[PDB]
Amino acid sequence: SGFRKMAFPSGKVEGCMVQVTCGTTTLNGLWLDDVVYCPRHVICTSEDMLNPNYEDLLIRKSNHNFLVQAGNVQLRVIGHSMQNCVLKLKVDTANPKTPKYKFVRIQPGQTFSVLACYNGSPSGVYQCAMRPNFTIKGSFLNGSCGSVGFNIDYDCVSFCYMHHMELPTGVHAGTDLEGNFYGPFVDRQTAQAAGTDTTITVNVLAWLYAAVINGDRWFLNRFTTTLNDFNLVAMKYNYEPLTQDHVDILGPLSAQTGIAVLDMCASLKELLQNGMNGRTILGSALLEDEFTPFDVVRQCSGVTF
Amino acid sequence: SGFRKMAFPSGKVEGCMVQVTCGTTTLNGLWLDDVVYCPRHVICTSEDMLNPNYEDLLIRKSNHNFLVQAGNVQLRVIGHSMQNCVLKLKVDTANPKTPKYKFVRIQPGQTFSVLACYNGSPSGVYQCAMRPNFTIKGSFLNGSCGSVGFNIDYDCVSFCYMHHMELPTGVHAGTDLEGNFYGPFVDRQTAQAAGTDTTITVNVLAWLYAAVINGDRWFLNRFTTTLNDFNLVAMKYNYEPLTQDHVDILGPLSAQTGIAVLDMCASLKELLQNGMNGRTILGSALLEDEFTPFDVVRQCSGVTF
Ligand SMILES: *CC(=O)Nc1ccc(N(C(=O)c2ccco2)[C@@H](C(=O)NCc2ccccc2)c2cccnc2)cc1
Ligand SMILES: *CC(=O)Nc1ccc(N(C(=O)c2ccco2)[C@@H](C(=O)NCc2ccccc2)c2cccnc2)cc1
């Protein structure tokens, strides 16, 4: 029935997006209850970003120096606090459109939807993965900072990402909603190594299961392999090592398709050693790793929220 | 700054999604002002779908046989009318969350966002193209019928698609919001030929321009070609013929990159004749055709709504 890179419905997050202006810089903020969250470098000028002393820069700021606009609504700032790399602005009004929510720090390999915003207004939504090296391959222009990443569980929005920087390599870095960067990155305009990225093996396997479910099965052989022998191949091709924890979370997909995980591993080994011979899998000519086993189950079961 | 298949924010559409039940079948409907729109086969049983007489089947239905639920809200149906392949249910309450909207019949090659829904509840959002053969390659399970496709212009939602059927080939067909199918399809469970699909040449070219803008430029040669000579190649590789209308709409991208459209055509010719040599373009190993020139401009300019 088709398989697409699918983002969560963005409505509940759209109603939380605000514009935050501090003197001259304007970023996006996230308005939940009576608190607005945004990147702390909203307080920086251009020159500041080269080597900012955030504690000293914020000391020059008072509540009234922060202007927060929810579309046309004014939020009056009545308190401010720096938490790690995020600034929290207490406002005098609770957001009436605040959804049920939690703040979550995700693991590499997990996926989420990004609501790209500019000047507090939503521009688009897309699905992506936290890379093993804690970067994301987003689509973010100047002014997108403060855009957030999230997952939705039924009624509950779980915020996991706030956007903070573009590395000189064109990939993206940011924090959880407590302001702690993913990976080694700092909010400073200095060159920063992201480190060797790898392909998310358990996600590739999940996507191969999605392919079989949807009719694409040309890559099924009937070799099998062992975990240790497969991991030798995974290492050669810069794939993350597969663990019994990964095999276990693939269990439901293995059960639906009747294809043992180690059998799918042997198919993946042959795809890695021989490529795709100019064929495609679910409309792709590469091995796709930004679908989790949960993502496949959700899209293949029709789970709503 | 990265390039992603990006859907519109789905909030304005989420607030229009309702569940429509007629005796036993439950589909999605679209609630705008005091009218709910949904597929007319909401009135069919399983056996009906093989060869339905929709006029006779609807004659057995009264206003009170239709149950419409907006989350937990009841809409009282006070009128009903069949328009082509859609059923319109007049309800006694205007949707308070009705956005500014228009109904639009799109052209093949144009793109839109789909809000996949089940039982009136949104499941996910993704971007896709109306194929040249008037199918779409969606992700739709049983119960997704009535999900809609749309574009957003600033404040105005333009609805262009309502989902009606899955062809035995696994691709998808549906109507505009006046109930007229795209392509030759009928809402009947019979085998139906979709016809030769082709690749949307102007969109591939737009995406090549996006690649250059974002740093991927290995495919630039300095051959050029002519429209007629390129179209000979386009025909060989089942690409849509390129017209001066297409060249014109690529003008802004040509102006930004300083790369003449016929020069990009020569690059596309070499990519078609020689493939990608195991390299990638914007993270893909295939020539991507579901970005319009407008889509590239929007994502590359940071246009909000
Ligand atoms: C993630 C993100 O949003 N990054 C970002 C980059 C650049 C800016 N700045 C903008 O002006 C801007 C806002 C929207 C589009 O562009 C600058 C800024 O405000 N002044 C920079 C400058 C440069 C040269 C001469 C004068 C001024 C900015 C502000 C603060 C920190 N970095 C960059 C915002 C956000
Ligand atoms: C696009 C779309 O939504 N198509 C669709 C397929 C199948 C159904 N039906 C369902 O039951 C259903 C709803 C959600 C998931 O599945 C059937 C139906 O209601 N009864 C079919 C049936 C088959 C065998 C024995 C008894 C009954 C359906 C209803 C009307 C028309 N076609 C199919 C809904 C929608």
As a whole number of angstroms, the distance between CA A81 and CA A88 comes to: 5
Say how many residues make up chain B: 305
Phi, psi of A27 (to 5 degrees): -125, 175
Q: Is A20 within 8 Å of A89 (Cβ atoms)?
A: yes
Q: Is B120 within 8 Å of B145 (Cβ atoms)?
A: no
Q: Is B185 within 8 Å of B193 (Cβ atoms)?
A: no
* SS3 state at A204: helix
DSSP class per residue in chain B:
------BPP-HHHHTTEEEEEETTEEEEEEEETTEEEEEGGGG--TGGGGS--HHHHHHT--GGGEEEEETTEEEPEEEEEEETTEEEEEESS--TTPPSEEE--PPTT-EEEEEEEETTEEEEEEEEE--TTS-B-----TT-TT-EEEEEETTEEEEEEEEEEE-TTS-EEEE-TTSPBSTT--SSSS--------B-HHHHHHHHHHHHHTT--TT--S----HHHHHHHHHHTTBPPP-HHHHHHTHHHHHHHT--HHHHHHHHHHHHHH--TT--BTTBSS------HHHHHHHHHT---
Contact check, Cβ <8 Å, A119/B304: yes
Approach to solving: X-ray
Q: B1-14+100-197: what fold?
A: Thrombin, subunit H (2.40.10)
- Could you give the C-alpha distances from A264 to A208, A225, A249, A271, A287, in angstroms and in order? 8, 9, 14, 10, 13
Q: Is the CB of residue B284 less than 8 Å away from at least one CB of chain A? A: yes
Q: Is the CB of residue B143 below 6 angstroms from any atom belonging to ligand 2?
A: yes
Resolution, in Å, please? Answer: 1.7
Q: Provide the token pair at A49.
A: 């970003």
How many Cα atoms occupy the beta-carbon half-sphere of A122 within 13 Å? Answer: 27
Q: Which atom of ligand 1 is nearest to the CA of A25?
A: 19
| CATH class of the domain at B15-99 | mainly beta
> Searching chain A, which residue's CA lies closest to the CA of residue B289?
A283
Q: Is A1 within 8 Å of B2 (Cβ atoms)?
A: no
Q: Is A39 within 8 Å of B207 (Cβ atoms)?
A: no
Sketch the domain layout of chain B as residue ranges.
1-14+100-197, 15-99, 198-301
- Nearest CA to B72 out of A16, A156, A17, A155 is that of A155
> Searching chain B, which residue's CA lies closest to the CA of residue A304?
B123
What does DSSP assign to residue A244? H
Residue among B22, B25, B166 to mutate when testing ligand 2 (max atoms within 8 A of CB): B25
CATH superfamily of B198-301: main proteinase (3clpro) structure, domain 3 (1.10.1840.10)
Say which amino acid occupies B290.
E
A15-99 and A198-301: identical CATH topology: no
SS3 readout for A67-93: EEEECCEEECEEEEEEECCEEEEEECC
Q: Provide the token pair at A134.
A: 């804690």
Q: Which atom of ligand 2 is nearest to the CA of B165?
A: 1
Say which amino acid occupies B104.
V
